[PDB]
Amino acid sequence: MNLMLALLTNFTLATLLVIIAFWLPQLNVYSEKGSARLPFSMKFFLVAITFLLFDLEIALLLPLPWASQTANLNTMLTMALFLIILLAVSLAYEWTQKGLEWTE
Amino acid sequence: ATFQFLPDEARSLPPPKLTDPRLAFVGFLGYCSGLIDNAIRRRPVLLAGLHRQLLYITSFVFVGYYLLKRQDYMYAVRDHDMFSYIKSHPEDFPEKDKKTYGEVFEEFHPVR
Amino acid sequence: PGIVELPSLEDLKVQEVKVSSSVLKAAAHHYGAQCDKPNKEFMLCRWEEKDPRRCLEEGKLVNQCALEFFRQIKRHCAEPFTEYWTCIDYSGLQLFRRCRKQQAQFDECVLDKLGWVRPDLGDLSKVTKVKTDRPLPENPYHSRARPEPNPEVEGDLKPARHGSRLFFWTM
Amino acid sequence: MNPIIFIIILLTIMLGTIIVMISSHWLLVWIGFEMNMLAIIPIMMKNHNPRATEASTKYFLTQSTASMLLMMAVIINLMFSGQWTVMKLFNPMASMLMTMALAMKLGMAPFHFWVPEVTQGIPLSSGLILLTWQKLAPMSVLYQIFPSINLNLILTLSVLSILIGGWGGLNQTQLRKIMAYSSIAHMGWMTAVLPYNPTMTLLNLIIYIIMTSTMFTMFMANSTTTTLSLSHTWNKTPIMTVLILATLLSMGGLPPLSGFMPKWMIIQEMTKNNSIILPTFMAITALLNLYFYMRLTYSTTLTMFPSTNNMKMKWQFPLMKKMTFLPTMVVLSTMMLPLTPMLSVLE
Amino acid sequence: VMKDVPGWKVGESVFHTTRWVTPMMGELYGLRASEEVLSATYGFIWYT
Amino acid sequence: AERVAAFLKNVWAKEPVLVASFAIAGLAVILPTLSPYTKYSLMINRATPYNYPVPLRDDGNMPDVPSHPQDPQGPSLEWLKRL
Amino acid sequence: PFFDVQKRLGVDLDRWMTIQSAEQPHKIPSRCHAFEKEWIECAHGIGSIRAEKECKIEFEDFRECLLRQKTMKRLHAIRRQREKLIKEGKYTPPP
Amino acid sequence: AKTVLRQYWDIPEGTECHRKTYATTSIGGAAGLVVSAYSVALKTPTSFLEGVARTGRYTFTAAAIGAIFGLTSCISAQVREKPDDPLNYLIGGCAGGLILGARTRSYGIGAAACAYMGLTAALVKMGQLEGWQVFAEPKV
Amino acid sequence: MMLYIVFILSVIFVMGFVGFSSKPSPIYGGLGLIVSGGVGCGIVLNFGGSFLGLMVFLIYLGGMMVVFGYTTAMATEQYPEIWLSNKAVLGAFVTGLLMEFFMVYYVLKDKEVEVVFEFNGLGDWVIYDTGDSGFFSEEAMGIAALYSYGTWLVIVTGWSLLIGVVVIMEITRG
Amino acid sequence: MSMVYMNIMMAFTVSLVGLLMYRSHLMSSLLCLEGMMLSLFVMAALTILNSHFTLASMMPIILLVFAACEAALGLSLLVMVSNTYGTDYVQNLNLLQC
Numbered sequence A: 001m002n003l004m005l006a007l008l009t010n011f012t013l014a015t016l017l018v019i020i021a022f023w024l025p026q027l028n029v030y031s032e033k034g035s036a037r038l039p040f041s042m043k044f045f046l047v048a049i050t051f052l053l054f055d056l057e058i059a060l061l062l063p064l065p066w067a068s069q070t071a072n073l074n075t076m077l078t079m080a081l082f083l084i085i086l087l088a089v090s091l092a093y094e095w096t097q098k099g100l101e102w103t104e
Numbered sequence B: 001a002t003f004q005f006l007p008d009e010a011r012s013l014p015p016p017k018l019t020d021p022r023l024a025f026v027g028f029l030g031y032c033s034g035l036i037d038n039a040i041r042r043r044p045v046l047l048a049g050l051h052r053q054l055l056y057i058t059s060f061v062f063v064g065y066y067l068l069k070r071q072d073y074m075y076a077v078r079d080h081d082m083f084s085y086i087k088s089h090p091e092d093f094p095e096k097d098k099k100t101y102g103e104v105f106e107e108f109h110p111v112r
Numbered sequence C: 001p002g003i004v005e006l007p008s009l010e011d012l013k014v015q016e017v018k019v020s021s022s023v024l025k026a027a028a029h030h031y032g033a034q035c036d037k038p039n040k041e042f043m044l045c046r047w048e049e050k051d052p053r054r055c056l057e058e059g060k061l062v063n064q065c066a067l068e069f070f071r072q073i074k075r076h077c078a079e080p081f082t083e084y085w086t087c088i089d090y091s092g093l094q095l096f097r098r099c100r101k102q103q104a105q106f107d108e109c110v111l112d113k114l115g116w117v118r119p120d121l122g123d124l125s126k127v128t129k130v131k132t133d134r135p136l137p138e139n140p141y142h143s144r145a146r147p148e149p150n151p152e153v154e155g156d157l158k159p160a161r162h163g164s165r166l167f168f169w170t171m
Numbered sequence D: 001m002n003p004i005i006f007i008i009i010l011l012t013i014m015l016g017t018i019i020v021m022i023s024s025h026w027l028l029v030w031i032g033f034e035m036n037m038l039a040i041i042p043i044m045m046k047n048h049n050p051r052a053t054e055a056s057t058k059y060f061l062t063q064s065t066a067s068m069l070l071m072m073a074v075i076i077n078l079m080f081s082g083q084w085t086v087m088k089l090f091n092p093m094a095s096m097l098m099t100m101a102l103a104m105k106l107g108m109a110p111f112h113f114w115v116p117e118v119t120q121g122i123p124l125s126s127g128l129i130l131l132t133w134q135k136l137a138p139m140s141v142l143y144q145i146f147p148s149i150n151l152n153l154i155l156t157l158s159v160l161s162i163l164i165g166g167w168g169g170l171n172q173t174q175l176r177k178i179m180a181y182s183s184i185a186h187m188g189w190m191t192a193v194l195p196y197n198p199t200m201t202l203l204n205l206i207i208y209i210i211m212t213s214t215m216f217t218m219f220m221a222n223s224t225t226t227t228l229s230l231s232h233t234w235n236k237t238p239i240m241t242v243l244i245l246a247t248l249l250s251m252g253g254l255p256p257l258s259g260f261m262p263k264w265m266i267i268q269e270m271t272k273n274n275s276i277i278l279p280t281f282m283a284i285t286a287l288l289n290l291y292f293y294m295r296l297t298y299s300t301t302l303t304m305f306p307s308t309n310n311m312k313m314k315w316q317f318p319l320m321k322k323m324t325f326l327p328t329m330v331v332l333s334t335m336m337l338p339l340t341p342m343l344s345v346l347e
Numbered sequence E: 001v002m003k004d005v006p007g008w009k010v011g012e013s014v015f016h017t018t019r020w021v022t023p024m025m026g027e028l029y030g031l032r033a034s035e036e037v038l039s040a041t042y043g044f045i046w047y048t
Numbered sequence F: 001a002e003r004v005a006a007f008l009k010n011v012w013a014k015e016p017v018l019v020a021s022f023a024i025a026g027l028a029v030i031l032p033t034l035s036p037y038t039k040y041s042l043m044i045n046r047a048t049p050y051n052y053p054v055p056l057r058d059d060g061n062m063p064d065v066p067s068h069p070q071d072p073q074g075p076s077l078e079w080l081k082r083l
Numbered sequence G: 001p002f003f004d005v006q007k008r009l010g011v012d013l014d015r016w017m018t019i020q021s022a023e024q025p026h027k028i029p030s031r032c033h034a035f036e037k038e039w040i041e042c043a044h045g046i047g048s049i050r051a052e053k054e055c056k057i058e059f060e061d062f063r064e065c066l067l068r069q070k071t072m073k074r075l076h077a078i079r080r081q082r083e084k085l086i087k088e089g090k091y092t093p094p095p
Numbered sequence H: 001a002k003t004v005l006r007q008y009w010d011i012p013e014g015t016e017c018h019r020k021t022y023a024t025t026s027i028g029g030a031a032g033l034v035v036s037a038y039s040v041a042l043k044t045p046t047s048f049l050e051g052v053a054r055t056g057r058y059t060f061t062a063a064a065i066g067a068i069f070g071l072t073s074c075i076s077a078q079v080r081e082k083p084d085d086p087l088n089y090l091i092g093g094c095a096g097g098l099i100l101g102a103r104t105r106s107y108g109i110g111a112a113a114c115a116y117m118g119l120t121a122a123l124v125k126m127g128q129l130e131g132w133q134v135f136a137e138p139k140v
Numbered sequence I: 001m002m003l004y005i006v007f008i009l010s011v012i013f014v015m016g017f018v019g020f021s022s023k024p025s026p027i028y029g030g031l032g033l034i035v036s037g038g039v040g041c042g043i044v045l046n047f048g049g050s051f052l053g054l055m056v057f058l059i060y061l062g063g064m065m066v067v068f069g070y071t072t073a074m075a076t077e078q079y080p081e082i083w084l085s086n087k088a089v090l091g092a093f094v095t096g097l098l099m100e101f102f103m104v105y106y107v108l109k110d111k112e113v114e115v116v117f118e119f120n121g122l123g124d125w126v127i128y129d130t131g132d133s134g135f136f137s138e139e140a141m142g143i144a145a146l147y148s149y150g151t152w153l154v155i156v157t158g159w160s161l162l163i164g165v166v167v168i169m170e171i172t173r174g
Numbered sequence J: 001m002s003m004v005y006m007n008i009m010m011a012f013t014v015s016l017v018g019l020l021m022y023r024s025h026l027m028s029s030l031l032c033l034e035g036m037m038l039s040l041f042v043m044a045a046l047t048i049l050n051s052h053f054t055l056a057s058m059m060p061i062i063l064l065v066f067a068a069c070e071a072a073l074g075l076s077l078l079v080m081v082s083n084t085y086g087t088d089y090v091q092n093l094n095l096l097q098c
């Protein structure tokens, strides 16, 4: 219940500050004074997609602090290094294929 | 067994003869493949690359022999299973009482 | 289906050990050593029977031993123990390692006044053996009789009679 | 595509299929399909043109939808049996969902619309994979879950596929669309017999793959993708025209050729089960396939269509395409009927 | 509660087996004040 | 030996960040197999008792099973106290 | 599996996670462990055609543990009766 | 489709004509609705009303055939006093063919439909009499 | 009551789905999915799945949905169309909410409902487990077992992710 | 079944109908595909957590990881479609009509 209250307070206050920031006295009485390819490089797509794939790999590494408590440490250490090495191979592939370049 | 091409129990069966007519046909198919290989590449059909034609026959025969071994084993297993089941359930496979045609009545249908 | 058989409310009555979790934590190590025998008998019963209704009497003896154990502490070492579990209770995680001075006083009191020796690291996690008069359950799962296995094909493998017998093929 | 990358991508298409075939866990089956779909897309896209991009997108949408439905079937099965083992499902709604998902993956009617379009939009070598190797994994799951499939559903899919495949092929001049509708028709025979004898499903699948690979390989050999382009073969490689004729007649189920064997065996199994109307209806409807196979033989082998003058320049050069295994496959595609009893190895 | 409900055996198991079965929350706290049910069901999950 | 030494000096001068990465990754793969302490990580993980140690019914022929936790039979954590 | 490579090589690729009564970390049991164990042992080796009939009792109990449909229905019955009596004043719950 | 087919095949032939005609009209109408659904889905109508018109034209046409087959086949069996006769169904099937020759207005289609729907209807009656299985249950 | 928190969250879950499934502007459709994701995490949280709940936030919302919004801004919609401005979207949106409200109202009035299949309406708490006193998270034990038990899963998962990198570089090179 | 399952299955059905009923944007259809994944993740997680199937606790993660990789492939196809035609409208993908 506490976490819900904290979240509700944080965003309710944020909402109140935003609305009052928009509606304050102004003291004036007169009249006040689409879905296409945005010209944006394919390189920026590849960054976001590259981030996603690395983020999915990170999801698999997150259990590592708990996995190190296993008695099957031989298997666990081999699989941890395998996953990270494969992540490094992914980076090496993008790097050597000019996927990390910003020219052209 | 389990994921076994020829289980150990297949070794109790007589192997296919090396002069099996089905194995001769398999060798003949390999020979035909050798000739078609020459034809599609516009070589002299009968004479070109006898070394290649020899391996076509040998490869077909070699694989055909093991396929024929597995084929005969599977049919031996089908018969083994069938007879053992007939024994296990004698109530479902009784010996029919046989009557001679002197006793059996058959209607006669003249052709006139 | 049948009626779920339950014991009577009076069949479940027993003196309860109404002390807080920090009190139990402070006494846990000596309690494990002192009341091991009735405790292990009860836990053997629970794992063998897989039924809480079948080990109620063993559970009453667990309570009795715990009460007598805490009556001995109260008689002899009430003051060092009170200082010790009160130190445990302050911690939000009830950490042993923040109360070693008070633990030493309590430990030194039970050793002199009762001969209680605190078990060593690793001892209370040992698997021990229990001598019980209770019969060993025979069908604790209440399993029905298993279906008979399929009749087992056996004999000598012979060539198929007349071959594949597929339509006109003679082999 | 870098040749080493091409090899690794091809090996991953195969690995995804193999994972499906060796898995005993529904999650690993689902992974195999996902891995397989990931690796197939690049080979559909490899010639970089709007038609290839449209084909890959239509393929992605169909296969991803089917894989979500498969996952839903797996999860319903988990709730109603508490286990993941690949076998009969323990809920009729799960069985329907998995059957529909596998039908979409196979391109069976009425989920067939993607097959002619995707096959048309990708290169011949990619179409060969799509219509042969890609049928292995979904068929290998049907092989295992069939004890729980709804009989009326599976036979309705089979009948619709044979009808749609036969009718759809009558109106085609593009070779890739002909093979696509032919594939839809042949999937119908494979699944029609599945409830009765899955071994005949495997036999029809294997013979289908051999014959389909032979046709695609002969089309690749001459770089032909249309009926008229194929009609020039007689003036360049006469031997090829004869091999196409034999393979097409075999694909038409004519005895004494190989392609008669699956229809023969499937009719036998169905009649043993007192299914008489369905096999007869199936066999007559398959004459539609024979018709548009025969049309191709007419324009390829049995008559000589007009040529062009530049064709003479082609006379001075030899065929350089690999045509891997073509001599072996064409012999199997046509001359296997005398070895029909060999099907028992598939038991 | 079920004294005058026809064909209702009181305390009848829903399982064929006579083995002891651990009850679920609804069986234990089926007829108790919501304050205790909420604490039993979501107290641990919600504790800070 | 020398051509490799001339290779390392070049990457050390040009790509010290990558040389350090590969060096650390190699040590992460190799050192566990060489370390004499690696065997203790297995033992400590197994010595942590997460669930109750269910006692065994005594059939009269288990002389290696302690009757009491403070008896001298069964695994000892003396090795761990020193470590 | 279509090709039972796992059993041929004696290697466990995914069998470990197929059922909830298999070995679990730290011997944590599933809620329906005993019911799944009983059903699996009843149906073992006799084939699914036979098991669908001969092990219906174990499977029905296992399904009841899985989804608790019969238990919830019974609880719904007792609660509904209690509301009526509260709505008619013939029942006052104890403390 | 199961229950509707169960009502129809429960009524004895040559009797309860109004119930037989209702069962076939519902069967025919449902087939018309299915055809309309696919037709509208795959060949998009130029407007909302064209699509509704197409649904009515197809559904009414299919219900018209279903009604005429049921009535004519039940009237024939009743009048001739032959319940278990495939000829009655052959008569009703051709009547349906004529209707399909009228809704599409094509003497050729009507003649072809009557022969083929007439033959198909007779085979259905024979199958019911003799236990022919279309989707046969696996047995061996 | 807070005894129906899981049910209430699942009601919002469905409303978010009817939101983007009616397919408004992909910008607003993305918002509906983000709200559904957060509500879906709360549902998983209340069943004792803390890690699984936070993975939805970390990976599904902070990962995949960010890339969806990023891609939408680039190659789809740069400025949203007014929400519910199209009649088809409004009809679909209203229809799903009307169906949902009826399910909720009927299951709450009778404490059970038969929408195709029959469901119980007593509250989800009734099926919860009644005996937990272990010194660890069981969900954490299971996920940590990926590295001891799931060697095969790690291999095929890691391989697919690497191939995903190679594949997407092939697709996009054009 | 439990009350929560009513709405989770409803969410999957709603997203499936959304997926099968296209409008114009391909991205809108890709969002429905992710919606089905999210409902599958919740339904699987609830079933696994409630039943205390301990080793199955990793399965929803594997589902999430693989389906996100699928979505990345789907997005890459969308941008290639958008590069060709300037929009992600499905009506432009009708060349293979003939």
Ligand SMILES: CCCCCCCCCCCCO[C@@H]1O[C@H](CO)[C@@H](O[C@H]2O[C@H](CO)[C@@H](O)[C@H](O)[C@H]2O)[C@H](O)[C@H]1O
Binding pocket: A085, A088, A089, A092, A095, A096, F022, F023, F025, F026, F029
């Ligand atoms: C000690 C083992 C520790 C485990 C390490 C974990 C796995 C990491 C795998 C990374 C593999 C990268 O492999 C890398 O490939 C490219 C090939 O173009 C090589 O780099 C090469 O291409 C670049 C251009 O990009 C040239 O400028 C350079 O002269 C050349 O060396 C790198 O020298 C090599 O390091």
Ligand SMILES: CCCCCCCCCCCCO[C@@H]1O[C@H](CO)[C@@H](O[C@H]2O[C@H](CO)[C@@H](O)[C@H](O)[C@H]2O)[C@H](O)[C@H]1O
Binding pocket: A073, A074, A077, A078, A079, A081, A082, A085, A086, F029, F030, F032, F033, F034, F038, F039, F042
């Ligand atoms: C691209 C593929 C990348 C794959 C990378 C795989 C790299 C694996 C490197 C480490 C593998 C071995 O790592 C370590 O080796 C020693 C061997 O001395 C093992 O053995 C050590 O621990 C075990 C405990 O199980 C003790 O019983 C043993 O006495 C001790 O020697 C360790 O259990 C293991 O943790």
Ligand SMILES: CCCCCCCCCCCCO[C@@H]1O[C@H](CO)[C@@H](O[C@H]2O[C@H](CO)[C@@H](O)[C@H](O)[C@H]2O)[C@H](O)[C@H]1O
Binding pocket: A072, A075, D015, G010, G011, G012, G013, G016, G023, I148, I149, I151, I152, I155
């Ligand atoms: C395209 C790439 C293809 C690469 C193919 C590589 C295949 C790798 C197979 C890995 C599985 C090997 O075989 C399997 O491994 C694990 C760990 O070693 C073992 O599992 C071990 O760890 C956990 C601990 O509880 C349990 O699974 C089990 O108690 C224990 O035996 C299995 O008992 C063994 O059957």
Ligand SMILES: CCCCCCCCCCCCO[C@@H]1O[C@H](CO)[C@@H](O[C@H]2O[C@H](CO)[C@@H](O)[C@H](O)[C@H]2O)[C@H](O)[C@H]1O
Binding pocket: D277, H005, H006, H009, H010, H119, H120, H123, H124, H125, H126, H127, H128, H129, H130, H131, H132, H133, H134
């Ligand atoms: C150009 C020709 C095109 C192909 C034509 C194919 C015709 C195939 C024949 C139709 C199939 C047989 O039709 C089906 O037979 C079975 C017989 O068990 C009937 O079985 C019926 O028997 C009993 C009493 O008789 C009924 O109460 C019950 O409703 C139903 O089970 C079905 O009501 C009928 O629908």
Ligand SMILES: N=C(N)NC(=N)NCCc1ccc(I)c(Cl)c1
Binding pocket: B074, B075, B077, B078, D196, D197, D198, D199, D344, D347, H140
């Ligand atoms: N499922 C079916 N209907 N058919 C089937 N496989 N029947 C099993 C009978 C059989 C037949 C041939 C062989 I060789 C073997 Cl060993 C066994």
